[PDB]
């Protein structure tokens, strides 16, 4: 179709941009007038931006590709266990477009 640089771009640029986006709150913990069904929709995804942020702070990833797998896990779980029209899905989709744009610009 260098490891420190990749991981540093993922932390300081990619994650930063998602973290600060206005739709990232369903993908963060804690969740801060939310209805209870919607609270469950958010928290039933076992991957979130917090987990990725901590792994990046604590040198958890041996490869940048392992970081990308966590991101995939997060988006994938959203799409799998919610319906295509759902708010959480459309929000995940906008974050995912931002993620893929920024990933595309990562130095190679």
Numbering used by the authors: 20, 27 to 57, 60 to 135
From the paper:
Bromodomains (BRDs) are protein interaction modules that specifically recognize ε-N-lysine acetylation motifs, a key event in the reading process of epigenetic marks. The 61 BRDs in the human genome cluster into eight families based on structure/sequence similarity. Despite large sequence variations, all BRD modules share a conserved fold that comprises a left-handed bundle of four α helices (αZ, αA, αB, αC), linked by loop regions of variable length (ZA and BC loops), which line the Kac binding site and determine binding specificity. The four helices form a deep cavity that is extended by the two loop regions (ZA and BC loops), creating a largely hydrophobic Kac binding pocket.
The insertions at x3 are present in the N-terminal domain of BET family members. Closely spaced multiple Kac sites have also been shown to significantly increase affinity of the histone H4 N terminus for BRDT by simultaneous binding to the same BRD (Morinière et al., 2009). Recently, it was demonstrated that murine BRDT preferentially recognized diacetylated motifs, whereas most monoacetylated peptides tested did not bind tightly to mBRDT BRDs (Morinière et al., 2009). Recently, it was demonstrated that BRDT requires two Kac residues for high-affinity binding (Morinière et al., 2009). Our SPOT array and ITC data showed that multiple Kac sites are generally required for specific recognition of the histone H4 tail by all human BET family members. For the first BRDs of the BET family, a spacer of two glycine residues was optimal.
